[PDB]
């Protein structure tokens, strides 16, 4: 029924089991020389760790793994959720808000507690005039306040729109007419390649933005 | 693949016996439910006519009242 | 909590193979002659810790068969996708049945 | 059920964190070339 | 006994189905036994509409076509990249052992 | 796929007409297994399989029901 | 020193080969490991901690 993908109230075993899916798809290491999937997963993680270390800095020892785990959580829910009957956890705004709000609070509160006057000088972007200074302060306060909203919305609303556009094409895929079915399947192949790329891009966007907010 | 194996004769006899029973049961049930579907369509035609007449009258009167209310709101 | 199970003896069983059951040698369910199947079911305890141990042993057997070998393929990942899609269809059994195409069937 | 969603999501994010924490390849490339120069001969008397 | 690491994983027919499922029936139903069991199962699910052909069946079909095309096009390249890395690691460990002996 | 057609010819064919006295001797043996024993002496792997096989016979019955009713999805 | 070097050479000769080595036998033969009261990292490397 169009929106029936986004109904977690399914049965006695609800659709919240879509969050235990990343425990199944995480590589387990037994032998000393790794297998193909373990080596591929470790190579991707090492590559992203090297990319995020440039933006992090030396005073962010905990940000090596705290953003990588968030990247894998978002990536697995976005990627394995696009398979047909699997519920997509990050489509809902609750899960994305649950990921974005606590780390943003852990950035804002810790920066205010640790360096207060440095943050107040950081409000002025080093050259703006004093009459525009209160406006820049208000701009900085508002822009920091809508940071976790613009992460949760950008992940949840994008995943919802990405699966509703597939559901609209699926509902028009009649089985009696083979021509319409072949058009629907070909257009869904184009759309699903776009959705897989958008899924990985949006997880990388969240990792990059959490790293930038952690360092700043 | 592996060399072929002839199935057990009891398995083949039961499988094709179930196939034959399935064909005659499908023919019997389709013939049975065709009359039921025809009777359901017969009564649903009258039910559709009554529902269509009542709903169209109710929709037309509600549309007239709604257009009068919106003309009252707009002042035209 | 992480620790080896109490039946594991590194001086007897060699290195730790998590897919292996290190307890007393019970008859596997495949070769039970079904006249003693109720006795076999009563012999195995139904504790949630033992159930989670049997699930973990099975998951490590599957890891050892399809993932842990060096030149492993994408067959384990397709098995996970199909197994998750079937399970999530059985979860949403009502949500898909209530939008059927035919009536009698 | 936002409270249970929040608790399960954070427990899973911590579980993913401790899965990545043990995902590394211990490279034993500690070369023992230093022992080629650690030995010093006995000094004589001059 | 000590665990051993086989070079090749378990045998798989039709992309993901294990080969042990197909060879389990060979004592009784031959080679087309399991295949006709799966065919009868899929026909029965689509007959009694237990498996309802919804808007997600065509998503699953498009995923299956994309997955087959992507795997057949990039499986050799990705397996070669991974086995190159594993060989480099094993070569580095062997070089370490030889250097320690020297 | 030609070998699959060869196996279909070998294995998906109706049984021989001369094995009808034989299979009844098998069927009564199942009756001899329905009263005395020969089933509580069955390994669960074998028992699993015997059930599995039977499910295949019942699925052939539903295939035959699809043949008798024509279309696959429902009774049209 | 000769006795120590011969003992180390014999121990390395008697070690299980890395092809058949599980990740715990490697940590038994190389007891540096990675422990709870140890400098950590997601990539537990030779230089991800301190060095500042
Ligand atoms: C960048 C670096 C890597 C990044 C990380 C990658 C991690 C995974 C690596 C896997 C390790 C490995 O073994 O690789 C070597 C592997 C090669 O292994 P191999 O077995 O030696 O080679 C196979 C040969 O081609 C031999 O096979 P073949 O060419 O002869 O063809 C086999 C098969 C061709 O088919 C396939 O194998 C592909 C089919 C996939 C589609 C399945 C969809 C099912 C949905 C149904 C839902 C209902 O064709 C058939 O025999 C016909 C059967 C068709 C399959 C069944 C179709 C199901 C239909 C519905 C059933 C009901 O290569 C790859 O896996 C390349 C693809 C890369 C992995 C993609 C990841 C998939 C999803 C993973 C889970 C989510 C992760 C999230 C992150 C996503 C990426 C960022
Ligand atoms: C749809 C397929 C998509 C899902 C495929 C997933 C396959 C996983 C099972 C792999 C397996 O059997 O070996 C691993 C491993 C082997 O254990 P083992 O029996 O001690 O191994 C000794 C030998 O392998 C001796 O055991 P074996 O593996 O040789 O036994 C084979 C025997 C099965 O043995 C038994 O007595 C039954 C036990 C089954 C074990 C698997 C339980 C969990 C399966 C989850 C299913 C998810 C969907 O085969 C059957 O009788 C199965 C026939 C069932 C009807 C299918 C008819 C053919 C369909 C063809 C359609 C084509 C058109 O299985 C386990 O015990 C753990 C299974 C893994 C569970 C977690 C991962 C699930 C991934 C999703």
From Swiss-Prot, chain A:
The chain crosses the membrane at residues 13-33, 54-76, 93-113, 119-139, 155-175, 181-201. The keyword Transport applies. The keyword Metal-binding does not apply. One of its GO terms (molecular function) is proton-transporting ATP synthase activity, rotational mechanism. GO terms for cellular component: mitochondrial inner membrane; proton-transporting ATP synthase complex. It is a multi-pass membrane protein. Keywords: ATP synthesis, CF(0), Hydrogen ion transport, Ion transport, Membrane, Mitochondrion, Mitochondrion inner membrane, Transmembrane, Transmembrane helix, Transport. It is found in: Mitochondrion inner membrane. InterPro entries: ATP_synth_F0_asu (IPR000568), ATP_synth_F0_asu_AS (IPR023011), ATP_synth_F0_asu_bact/mt (IPR045083), F0_ATP_A_sf (IPR035908). F-type ATPases have 2 components, CF(1) - the catalytic core - and CF(0) - the membrane proton channel. CF(1) has five subunits: alpha(3), beta(3), gamma(1), delta(1), epsilon(1). CF(0) has three main subunits: a, b and c. Mitochondrial membrane ATP synthase (F(1)F(0) ATP synthase or Complex V) produces ATP from ADP in the presence of a proton gradient across the membrane which is generated by electron transport complexes of the respiratory chain. F-type ATPases consist of two structural domains, F(1) - containing the extramembraneous catalytic core and F(0) - containing the membrane proton channel, linked together by a central stalk and a peripheral stalk. During catalysis, ATP synthesis in the catalytic domain of F(1) is coupled via a rotary mechanism of the central stalk subunits to proton translocation. PANTHER family: ATP SYNTHASE SUBUNIT A (PTHR11410:SF0). Belongs to the ATPase A chain family. This is ATP synthase subunit a. It comes from Artemia franciscana. The gene is ATP6.
Curated annotation (Swiss-Prot), chain D:
It is found in: Mitochondrion membrane. Its main location: mitochondrion. The chain crosses the membrane at residues 3-23. Coiled coil: none annotated. The keyword DNA-binding does not apply. Signal peptide: none annotated. One of its GO terms (cellular component) is mitochondrial membrane. It is a single-pass membrane protein. Keywords: ATP synthesis, CF(0), Hydrogen ion transport, Ion transport, Membrane, Mitochondrion, Transmembrane, Transmembrane helix, Transport. GO terms for biological process: ATP biosynthetic process; proton transmembrane transport. The keyword Signal does not apply. Belongs to the ATPase protein 8 family. F-type ATPases have 2 components, CF(1) - the catalytic core - and CF(0) - the membrane proton channel. Mitochondrial membrane ATP synthase (F(1)F(0) ATP synthase or Complex V) produces ATP from ADP in the presence of a proton gradient across the membrane which is generated by electron transport complexes of the respiratory chain. F-type ATPases consist of two structural domains, F(1) - containing the extramembraneous catalytic core and F(0) - containing the membrane proton channel, linked together by a central stalk and a peripheral stalk. During catalysis, ATP synthesis in the catalytic domain of F(1) is coupled via a rotary mechanism of the central stalk subunits to proton translocation. This is ATP synthase protein 8. It comes from Artemia franciscana (Brine shrimp). The gene is MT-ATP8.
């Amino acid at each position: 029924s169009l929106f029936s993908v986004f109904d977690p109230t399914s049965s006695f075993l609800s659709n919240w089991l879509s969050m235990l899916i990343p425990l199944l798809f995480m590589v387990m290491s037994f032998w000393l020389i790794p297998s193909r999937p373990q080596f591929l997963a470790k190579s991707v993680l090492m590559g992203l760790n090297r990319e995020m270390s440039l933006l992090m800095g030396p005073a962010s020892f905990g940000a090596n793994i705290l953003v990588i785990a968030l990247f894998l959580f978002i990536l697995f829910n976005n990627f394995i959720g696009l398979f047909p009957y699997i519920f997509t956890a990050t489509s809902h705004l609750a899960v994305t808000l649950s990921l974005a709000v606590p780390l943003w609070i852990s950035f804002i509160l810790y920066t205010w507690i640790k360096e207060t006057t440095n943050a107040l000088a950081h409000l002025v972007p080093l050259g703006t005039p004093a009459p525009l200074m209160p406006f820049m302060v208000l701009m900085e306060i508002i822009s920091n306040m809508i940071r976790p909203i613009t992460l949760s919305v950008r992940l949840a609303a994008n995943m919802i729109a990405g699966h509703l556009l597939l559901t609209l094409l699926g509902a028009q895929g009649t089985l009696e007419n083979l021509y319409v079915t072949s058009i629907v399947v070909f257009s869904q192949i184009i759309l699903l390649m776009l959705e897989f790329s958008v899924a990985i891009i949006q997880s990388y966007v969240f990792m990059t933005l959490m790293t930038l907010y952690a360092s700043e | 693949f592996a060399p072929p194996v002839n199935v057990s004769p009891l398995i083949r006899a039961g499988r094709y016996g179930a196939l034959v029973v399935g064909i005659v049961y499908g023919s019997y049930r389709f013939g049975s439910l065709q009359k039921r579907e025809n009777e359901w369509r017969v009564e649903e035609a009258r039910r559709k006519v009554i529902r269509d007449a009542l709903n169209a009258e109710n929709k037309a009167k509600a549309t007239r009242e709604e257009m009068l209310y919106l003309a009252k709101e707009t002042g035209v | 909590f992480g620790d080896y199970p109490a039946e594991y003896n590194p001086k007897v069983h060699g290195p730790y193979d998590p897919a292996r059951f290190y307890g007393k040698a019970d008859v596997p369910l495949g070769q039970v002659k079904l006249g003693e199947l109720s006795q076999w079911l009563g012999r195995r305890n139904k504790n949630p810790q033992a159930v989670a141990a049997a699930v973990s042993r099975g998951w490590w057997r599957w890891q050892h068969k399809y993932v842990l070998p060096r030149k492993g393929g994408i067959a384990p990942y397709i098995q996970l996708i199909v197994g998750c899609s079937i399970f999530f269809y059985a979860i949403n059994y009502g949500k898909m049945v209530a939008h059927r195409q035919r009536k009698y069937h | 059920p936002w409270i249970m969603v929040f608790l399960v999501s954070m427990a899973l994010l911590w579980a993913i964190m401790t899965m990545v924490f043990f995902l590394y390849q211990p490279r034993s490339v500690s070369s023992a070339k230093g022992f080629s120069d650690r030995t010093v001969y006995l000094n004589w008397k001059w | 006994p000590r665990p051993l690491r086989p070079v090749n994983p378990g045998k798989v027919r039709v992309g993901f189905v294990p080969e042990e499922w197909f060879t389990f029936f060979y004592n009784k139903t031959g080679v087309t036994g399991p295949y006709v069991l799966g065919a009868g199962a899929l026909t029965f699910l689509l007959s009694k509409e237990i498996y309802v052909v919804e808007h997600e069946f065509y998503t699953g079909v498009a995923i299956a076509i994309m997955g087959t095309y992507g795997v057949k096009k990039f499986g050799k390249q990705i397996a070669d990249y991974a086995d190159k890395g594993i060989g480099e690691i094993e070569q580095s460990f062997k070089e370490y052992q030889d250097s320690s002996k020297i | 796929l030609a070998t699959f057609l060869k196996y279909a010819k070998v294995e998906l064919t109706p049984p021989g007409p001369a094995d009808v006295p034989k299979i009844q001797e098998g069927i009564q043996n199942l009756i001899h297994s329905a009263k005395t024993g020969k089933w509580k002496q069955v390994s669960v792997r074998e028992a699993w399989l015997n059930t599995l096989i039977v499910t295949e016979i019942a699925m052939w019955f539903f295939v035959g029901e699809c043949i008798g009713k024509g279309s696959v999805i429902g009774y049209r | 020193r000769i006795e120590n070097y011969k003992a180390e050479l014999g121990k390395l000769g008697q070690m299980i080969p890395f092809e058949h080595m599980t990740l715990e036998d490697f940590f038994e033969a190389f007891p540096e490991k990675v422990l709870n009261p140890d400098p950590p990292s997601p990539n537990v490397k030779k230089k991800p901690f301190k060095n500042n």
